[PDB]
Design a protein around this ligand. Structure first.
Ligand code: K
Ligand code: K
Ligand code: K
Ligand code: K
Ligand code: K
Ligand code: K
Ligand code: K
Ligand code: MG
Ligand code: MG
Ligand code: MG
Ligand code: MG
Ligand code: MG
Ligand code: MG
Ligand code: MG
Ligand code: MG
Ligand code: MG
Ligand code: MG
Ligand code: MG
Ligand code: MG
Ligand code: MG
Ligand code: MG
Ligand code: MG
Ligand code: MG
Ligand code: MG
Ligand code: MG
Ligand code: MG
Ligand code: MG
Ligand code: MG
Lengths: 196, 101, 49, 128, 313, 65, 88, 132, 512
RNA sequence: GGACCUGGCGGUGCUUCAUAUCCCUCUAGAGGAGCCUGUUCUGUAAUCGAUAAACCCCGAUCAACCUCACCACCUCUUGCUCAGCCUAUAUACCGCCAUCUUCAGCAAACCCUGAUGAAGGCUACAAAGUAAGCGCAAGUACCCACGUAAAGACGUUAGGUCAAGGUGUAGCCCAUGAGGUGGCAAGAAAUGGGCUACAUUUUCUACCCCAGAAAACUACGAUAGCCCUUAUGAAACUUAAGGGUCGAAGGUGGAUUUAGC
């Protein structure tokens, strides 16, 4: 005799079970494992949406059965031990600017495929306010001319974008190097400057 | 095992162009300025002209990778319109649908 | 790499792990052309000699 | 090219030419039409030209209570398999050509006089 | 695909067990889990972006999902239950017989918010298929029943075949009257014309000043026709020189911007005029968003409508 | 990656060969697709190329080593 | 996890392109295709690097098939010590 | 008349699946996509490479499970994971399905240099949506 | 997350047609999947050029083909070391012979590296993908030939010869070689002594007192040579004393107390050997009772790490005594230790996992309340293991003792789902219990729906190829259940089967 | 040969209509000039296909080499391929389409009428039809319920495409296959589509709508010709861009004809 398929194990599931144990991680829809009479499909005339068994439309969906509200809350209770506490002193953005005047922007790109590489990820953007820097009248004027369009008068923020090095850590160190040589050259006074 | 002899010639052109890319880039740099002497640039002209013809990147043709069709190709997928539509019309190209507006 | 794909799947067919319906179709057409007398000649022994 | 290959259904639908302007109005004086043959009929998954024996696919997984290992049929042992498959294939062709003899009616090519059997049983279990 | 009573009974047992499973998945009380909660949970667990909602995952009660099926119309002996069975339309003709019988008894004794049900709704009350002329004949017979001195018993019957229709009032909505720091009453509205979008602030009291993106309206609109559009709402209600306006407009061209401001000012001006004046502005075309936008070009033709020249033959 | 003038010590300090190589290094310093190893290869190629062309350069009054 | 999060939906992008319908000739008959890219932007604020590693790993591992993520991180840094005072 | 991916009306005896019964204009309206990845989103790269891989896996699985596939493959990519979801018939012995799953997952993992998993859903017979 | 009790193990395909329905299918389905993986690896390694395109970033070293062939074709020392790393016994010997005939110098470290390869595999080639009883140390082998020809021999050279001989059961030769090492004023290592302890016991058959005096002499020699014993030294002593049983019971406990003092920590293997040594056939209550109770008080709440190859045998051994002693409180402590931390990974292979759970569940059904027994039945089967037909019977015997027979139809449904549809001992047991006594009409009807399905099982057996065999008890019970249910028509029809098969009718059936 | 059935057709009847649509009517065009581009002819050693509607900026969202399939010359023979062939056959086909369609019909299975002929099957105060399914419709996309897209069956034109790819049959196999070098791709002429114009509702400049000048042989008018420079490329009288020079036909276009609610 041919092999007879067993009945689906949904018939053994209790209505008060721990569902996260059934779908612990992302997995494709399994009719024999999902105890729901869910149907999908545009119905024919005087018909009904197709049943879940052999339903390709339900297989095409990126389901969230592994991310039920019950699961998310249990998952986050286990992930609290990995987190750190934000300093209470930094209550407002204005207080953050006072103590941490430099902002470093970087971007990570999550795509699907065999290669995790993305050339856009190397870019670094450094933003600082000239008010935060110890610049006298002469130095602030010279710094604005040197940076040109990188400085915005409305916001008083100097934006240095570095993307010429292969790596992000190199583009970060180069942005700091630029801020350092720009700061020290702004304080230096050459003899040709007298001809302003 | 490539689709046809014309795809096989383009495969070879892409391989040889890759091998000579640095050499051609360096020689061209000598020809693409007004700084170096003409006597030096005239020699560089002859040197880049003496390289194999199939090392020249303008001879590379973007053919359909499955059918080798030389025109009607969409660069993003490297497929001819006919092959692209076949996959798109069967719902096998992620996110691609018919446009109505 | 059309060489890799074609050579890999040809090898998998000879190993019995891949069924190439297209190749089987071509093999049956070539088999029936022998019985019909339309066989490929030997190189150098073509109809013109 | 591997990517230029099609399925058997596509290959037979094209090769047979059952649909076309020629079929529309019997535009051609044709008699013997090509008939599609199923090339997967006598084929066993796991069997290849090289004659490898894959445990769990084309040979039993366990032999004498132990798991079998990868093996390959000998050249002689594989020739027999190929010949046996050809003979099995020839039997399929031979039998299909062979036919039962229709009893004729008033003349050899006429339908008149030929029996069609009993009428079909009616919906309400009625029989003739 | 016929569905028997035993099949539906099993489908309802599955839906009730699955209803408790779905509630258990989402950590909600199974007892107070409604159909609105089911739809929300199914949309989260099985997100589908298909434009047609009927093709999306659904977990509905079997009664909602499966079509209505007529029960068997005869018993074991084969005798039909209804005396009009052999007409093939026993439910339709039983209704015509019942309405015709009531019309007879009356003789022996002697609109805005409602409509007649459509043929597809009658075809469900009866659970039969109807022709169009069958539907008309039935309606002609009900209308003939209203014209008579129908009593209470003859009125509950006619109301079964009447469906309440919710008329939507065309009365223009009025914006709230707000107050600024200085205590000046004003209203605010918005308008769209083509790709231009405008937002206008109309003050209850003023001298007739209009600022468009901070500029005097005659400097912003040097074309006299664009200024006539700004005049149109206030002139129509006799309020030229009585309100101050500060509006902002972006997108579109000069004419589309004047149209967007015209609509924004008219809507905001409705807060300071009488209800009868607001209906006159509506009837004058001052409160309707113009839906006329550029039509797309189609492939294979020169323009949105123009075709390529039909080549000489 | 960004400071490649240490690799031009073998080239002339003034003249056209210096001006040309300052453009090469300027372009290499802006290339994030090349490793330091590959950038030096470009520079070393020009150093050898100009050594073989000494006679031609002398005719033009340029002295490469 | 106690992280402050705001959400908004940037405007969608629809890229449309046209292709010939027939294999041969019939230029005036085309088939048009489109790719719809929809966006959701989660904006988290005032979180440490250790909290960002756990949250991003948790939500990146659960990124549905067909969904890409671009996470822009803005780091707070103090002035380099060399820049605090002029040498000159 | 349009032909692309349209199963044409017959005498009412041809069973079609839900995938087969919907022409291309129903894609994203009544039917979803058979592969989901990020290559066709705005600002994403490598769409050409994902497309070649998908065409191979469909041909590969057709010939690796000959006569067993009851519907089109559903291809899912998450990170570097590749999930192949197939609806198959219940004719082949379970031992052969386990052999071919182990064989296919391993062979495809080394071919595309990524962890590949194959998920099989078995049905007694091809699921019929309508008879055209 | 915890184990899903409605599911089979994660390694199987989650599909009702592909899920294993028996312990046999559970074993064979994994072997078929592993076979497919081997066929894939065989192809990948046979045709590596098809699998050399690396599109992964970061690189995945574990998804590239392996190259098992030497790529240095020169005849020199640096080319021999390659064939030794690849473990090519023949090629390395041939390369060593040719290298020697030419007269070139081969270093000592390399000569030893060749012995380690020959002495481990016994001058035989390791198993590859594709090209017990007795001693496997041949009289004339390449290892001995190379060893003799060796010009200079260091301590390591002898040690690898002594360990290899004992590994291949050349116990007598290894002791003879241990004498030369001492005559040459050399010092062996702990690993060599571990092998010599194995040889002292297995070399000859003698009384325990004779064997126990030699071992103590090796250990004292190990202290004279300033060699410190490791865990395997004590584990080999206890493993080798298994033969003597009662004689070694007190000597074996002297080894354990010594481990604690010295500072070596007993592993799971150390207690498995003590458990097996004390669990000799007989009455275990005298001694085995307090050895297992003391072993668990020590191991209570301890997480274990792999230290000895025999660590995966403690849990199988410990449960075996709890069943013998019929102590359910001890069994819970053994299972509790298996459930602390990651101790569940020491259960062992599939054969050890099924034996452990068979003895564990069979002890629950016997000594545990039926309400708790049915909770373990749901938690273990089929989630943890597939039951043998003898546990279904042990389960029915528990329902009988508890007077809960409304569950019998469920046990039959599960039995079929576990591959026991066509077991005779099981169908006879179920039918006898159902038809033993009369029951209320509601229960009697349920028993008749099960007997009918059992009747169908007897009719549609795979033995249908042979003539159908109906036991006498089965026919009597099936008929009686139909009568008591009111399905008299079915009972009257069955009477023909008493004459067809010539089975004696029971007195009770005739009276009813 | 007689009489019929069905279909087609009628410079066929009556009635009612068409809605950018048949006439009249409305607006801007084509048909005239130059130029751009396709095709036909002629020419060339020098492709192919489309080619009334439904070909003619058509396969091409694209030819300086390449592409390339053509011509001349030279070279290779188990050949990138468990060969190859853009060789014949689209009148063998799959595939994807044109066309009516700016249609609403197609039709299984039954039933009935005609004496049980080809055939035919409706009247609602109803007289033999019931009809699954397909299409229309409905839904969906775009900014609505509007509009526009999309959709649009069965068939029609053996309609288009063997040169997208695949493929039946036949044919080539030291060549009808593969490679290299160089070369053709022009204009007596005709014709289709388009572009720019003939100007004062214009031309130039500022501005982006309150201006100043120009305005008939130094006006309007070439995106053409000639010269130079630049860009791309290895390669440019040749392709593109810019500049200079040049300042022609054209003075609003017959019969006829296209598009738009
Ligand atoms: K007629
Ligand atoms: K004209
Ligand atoms: K024209
Ligand atoms: K065709
Ligand atoms: K073709
Ligand atoms: K052909
Ligand atoms: K002029
Ligand atoms: Mg090109
Ligand atoms: Mg003939
Ligand atoms: Mg005859
Ligand atoms: Mg226009
Ligand atoms: Mg069309
Ligand atoms: Mg018109
Ligand atoms: Mg003209
Ligand atoms: Mg031509
Ligand atoms: Mg032609
Ligand atoms: Mg033709
Ligand atoms: Mg050429
Ligand atoms: Mg050419
Ligand atoms: Mg040719
Ligand atoms: Mg045709
Ligand atoms: Mg609409
Ligand atoms: Mg359309
Ligand atoms: Mg429609
Ligand atoms: Mg034709
Ligand atoms: Mg040739
Ligand atoms: Mg010019
Ligand atoms: Mg140039």
């Amino acid at each position: 005799p041919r092999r007879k398929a067993l009945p689906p194990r949904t018939e053994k599931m209790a209505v008060d079970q721990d569902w996260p144990s059934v779908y612990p991680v992302a997995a494709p829809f399994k009719p024999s494992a999902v105890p729901l009479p869910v149907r999908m499909g545009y119905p024919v005339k005087k018909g009904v949406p197709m049943a879940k068994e052999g339903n390709l439309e339900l297989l095409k969906i990126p389901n969230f059965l592994h991310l039920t509200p019950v699961a998310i809350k249990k998952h986050c209770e286990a992930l609290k031990d990995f987190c750190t506490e934000w300093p209470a002193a930094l209550d407002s953005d204005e207080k953050c600017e006072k103590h941490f005047p430099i902002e470093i922007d970087s971007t990570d790109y999550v795509s699907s495929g065999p290669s995790v590489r993305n050339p856009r990820a190397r870019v670094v953007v450094l933003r600082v306010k000239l008010s935060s820097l110890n610049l006298d009248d002469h130095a602030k004027k010279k710094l604005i001319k040197l940076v040109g369009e990188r400085y915005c008068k409305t916001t008083d923020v100097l934006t240095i974008k570095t993307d010429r090095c292969p790596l992000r850590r190199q583009n970060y160190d180069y942005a700091v190097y630029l801020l350092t040589v720009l700061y020290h050259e702004s304080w230096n006074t050459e003899e040709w400057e007298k001809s302003k | 095992h490539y689709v046809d002899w014309r795809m096989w010639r383009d495969v070879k052109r892409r391989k040889m162009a890759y091998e000579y890319a640095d050499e051609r880039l360096r020689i061209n740099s000598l020809r693409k300025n007004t700084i170096l002497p003409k006597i030096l640039q005239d020699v560089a002209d002859e040197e880049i002209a003496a390289l194999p013809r199939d090392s020249c990147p303008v001879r590379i043709r973007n053919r359909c990778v499955m059918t080798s069709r030389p025109r009607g190709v969409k660069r993003r997928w490297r497929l001819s319109r006919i092959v692209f539509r076949h996959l798109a019309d069967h719902g096998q190209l992620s996110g691609i649908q018919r446009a109505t507006w | 790499n059309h060489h890799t794909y074609a050579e890999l799947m040809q090898t998998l067919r000879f190993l019995g792990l891949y069924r190439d319906e297209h190749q089987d179709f071509m093999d049956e057409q070539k088999r029936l052309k022998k019985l019909r007398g339309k066989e490929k000649p030997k190189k150098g022994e073509g109809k013109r000699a | 090219s591997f990517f230029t290959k099609l399925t058997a259904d596509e290959l037979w639908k094209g090769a047979l030419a059952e649909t076309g302007a020629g079929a529309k109005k019997g535009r051609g004086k044709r008699t013997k039409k090509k008939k599609r043959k199923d090339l997967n009929r006598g084929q066993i998954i796991g069997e290849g030209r090289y004659g490898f024996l894959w445990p769990g696919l084309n040979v039993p997984l366990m032999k004498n209570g132990a798991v079998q290992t990868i093996a390959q049929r000998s050249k002689e042992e594989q020739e027999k398999v190929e010949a046996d498959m050809i003979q099995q294939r020839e039997e399929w062709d031979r039998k299909k050509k062979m036919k039962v003899k229709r009893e004729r009616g008033w003349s050899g090519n006429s339908w008149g006089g030929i029996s069609l059997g009993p009428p079909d049983p009616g919906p309400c279990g009625e029989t003739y | 695909e016929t569905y028997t009573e035993d099949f539906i009974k099993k489908q309802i047992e599955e839906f009730n067990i699955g209803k408790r499973h779905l509630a258990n998945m989402m950590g909600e009380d199974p007892e107070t889990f409604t159909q609105e909660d089911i739809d929300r949970a199914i949309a989260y667990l099985f997100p589908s972006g298909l434009f047609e909602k009927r093709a999306r995952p659904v977990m509905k009660h079997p009664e909602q999902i499966f079509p209505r099926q007529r029960a068997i119309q005869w018993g074991e002996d084969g005798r039909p239950f209804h005396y009009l069975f052999y007409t093939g339309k026993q439910s339709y003709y039983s209704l015509m017989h019942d309405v015709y019988g009531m019309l007879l008894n009356l003789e022996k004794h002697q609109v805005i918010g409602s409509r007649w049900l459509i043929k597809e709704e009658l075809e469900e009350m009866l659970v039969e298929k109807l022709s169009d002329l069958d539907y008309m004949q039935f309606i002609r017979l009900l209308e003939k029943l209203l014209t008579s001195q129908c009593g209470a018993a003859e009125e509950e019957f006619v109301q079964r075949f009447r469906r309440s229709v919710t008329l939507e009032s065309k009365k223009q909505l009025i914006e709230p009257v707000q107050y600024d720091e200085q205590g000046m009453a004003f209203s605010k509205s918005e308008g769209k014309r083509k790709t231009a979008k405008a937002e206008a602030i109309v003050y209850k009291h003023g001298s007739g000043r209009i600022k468009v993106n901070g500029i005097d309206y005659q400097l912003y609109f040097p074309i006299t026709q664009d200024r006539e559009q700004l005049m149109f709402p206030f002139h129509f209600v006799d309020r030229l020189g009585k309100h101050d306006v500060t509006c902002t407009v972006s997108g579109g061209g000069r004419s589309a911007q004047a149209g967007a401001i015209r609509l924004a000012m008219a809507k905001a001006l409705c807060s300071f005029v009488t209800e009868d004046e607001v209906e006159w502005m509506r009837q004058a075309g001052l409160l309707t968003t113009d839906p006329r936008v550029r039509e797309r070009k189609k492939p294979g033709q020169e323009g949105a409508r123009r075709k390529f020249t039909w080549k000489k033959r | 990656h960004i400071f490649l003038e240490k690799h031009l010590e073998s080239f002339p300090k003034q003249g056209p060969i210096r001006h040309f190589m300052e453009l090469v290094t300027c372009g290499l310093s802006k290339n994030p697709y090349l490793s330091v190893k590959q950038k030096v290869e470009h520079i070393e190629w020009f150093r050898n190329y100009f050594n073989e062309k000494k006679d031609i350069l002398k005719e033009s009054n340029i002295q490469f080593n | 996890l106690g992280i402050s999060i705001k959400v908004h939906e940037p405007p969608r992008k629809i890229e449309r392109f046209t292709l010939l319908q027939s294999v041969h000739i019939y230029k005036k008959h085309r088939v048009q295709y489109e790719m719809r890219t929809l966006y959701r932007c989660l904006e988290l604020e005032h979180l440490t690097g250790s909290t960002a590693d756990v949250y991003l790993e948790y939500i990146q591992r659960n990124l549905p098939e067909g969904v890409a993520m671009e996470v822009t991180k803005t780091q707070l840094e103090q002035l380099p010590e060399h820049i605090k005072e002029p040498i000159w | 008349k349009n032909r692309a991916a349209r199963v044409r009306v017959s005498k009412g005896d041809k069973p079609v699946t839900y995938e087969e019964a919907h022409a291309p204009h129903y894609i994203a309206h009544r039917k979803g996509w058979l592969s989901l990845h990020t290559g066709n989103l705005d600002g994403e790269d490598h769409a050409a490479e994902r497309t070649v891989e998908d065409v191979f896996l469909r041909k590969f699985m057709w010939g690796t499970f000959p006569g067993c596939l009851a519907d089109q493959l559903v291809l899912k990519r998450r990170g570097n994971q590749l999930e192949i979801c197939a609806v198959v018939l219940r004719q082949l012995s379970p031992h052969k399905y386990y052999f071919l799953v182990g064989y296919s997952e391993t062979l495809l993992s080394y071919f595309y240099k990524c962890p590949v998993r194959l998920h099989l859903q078995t049905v007694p017979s091809k699921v019929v949506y309508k008879y055209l | 997350v915890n184990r899903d009790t409605t599911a089979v193990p994660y390694v199987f395909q989650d599909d009702p047609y592909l899920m294993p329905a028996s312990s046999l299918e559970s074993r064979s389905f994994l072997l078929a999947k592993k076979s497919g993986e081997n066929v894939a690896k065989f192809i990948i390694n046979s045709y590596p050029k098809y699998f050399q395109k690396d599109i992964a970033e970061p690189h995945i070293p574990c998804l590239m083909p392996e190259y098992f062939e030497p790529q240095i074709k020169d005849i020199s020392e640096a080319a021999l070391k390659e064939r030794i790393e690849l473990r090519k016994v023949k090629a390395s010997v041939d390369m060593f012979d040719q290298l020697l005939q030419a007269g070139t110098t081969v270093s000592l470290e390399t000569t030893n590296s060749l012995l380690d390869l020959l002495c481990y595999y016994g001058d035989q080639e390791p198993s590859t993908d594709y090209h017990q009883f007795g001693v496997t140390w041949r009289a004339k082998n390449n290892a001995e030939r190379i060893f003799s020809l060796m010009p200079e021999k260091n301590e390591h050279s002898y040690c690898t010869m002594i360990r290899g001989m004992v590994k291949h059961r050349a116990y007598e030769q290894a002791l003879n070689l241990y004498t030369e090492l001492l005559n040459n004023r050399l010092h062996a290592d702990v690993y060599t002594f571990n092998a010599l302890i194995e040889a002292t016991v297995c070399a000859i058959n003698e009384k325990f007192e004779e064997k126990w005096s030699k071992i103590l002499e090796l250990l004292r020699h190990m202290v004279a040579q300033k060699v410190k014993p490791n865990l395997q030294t004590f584990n080999t002593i206890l493993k080798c004393l298994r033969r003597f049983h009662v004689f070694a019971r007190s000597p074996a406990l002297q080894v354990l107390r010594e481990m604690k003092a010295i500072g070596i920590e007993p592993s799971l293997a150390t207690y498995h050997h003590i458990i097996r040594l004390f669990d000799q056939p007989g009455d275990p209550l005298k001694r085995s009772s307090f050895i297992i109770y003391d072993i668990m008080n020590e191991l209570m709440g301890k997480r274990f790490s792999p230290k000895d190859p025999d660590d995966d045998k403690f849990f199988q051994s410990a449960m075996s005594i709890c069943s013998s002693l019929r102590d359910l409180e001890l069994a819970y402590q053994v299972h509790g230790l298996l459930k602390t931390g990651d101790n569940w990974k020491f259960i062992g292979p599939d054969q050890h996992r099924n034996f452990y759970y068979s003895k564990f569940f069979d002890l629950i059904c016997l000594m545990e309340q039926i309400d708790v027994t049915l909770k373990w039945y749901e938690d273990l089967i089929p989630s943890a293991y597939f039951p043998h037909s003898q546990t279904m019977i042990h389960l029915l015997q528990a329902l009988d003792v508890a007077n809960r027979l409304e569950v019998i139809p469920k046990i039959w449904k599960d039995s079929k789902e576990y591959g026991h549809t066509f077991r005779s001992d099981l169908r006879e047991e179920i039918l006898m219990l159902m038809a033993r006594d009369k029951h209320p009409p509601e229960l009697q009807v349920a028993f008749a729906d099960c007997a009918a399905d059992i009747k169908s099982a007897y009719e549609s057996q795979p033995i249908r190829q042979t003539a159908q065999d109906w036991p006498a008890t089965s026919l009597n019970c099936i008929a009686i259940l139909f009568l008591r249910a009111g399905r008299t028509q079915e009972a009257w029809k069955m009477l023909g089967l008493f004459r067809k098969h010539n089975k004696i009718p029971r007195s009770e059936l005739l009276n009813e």
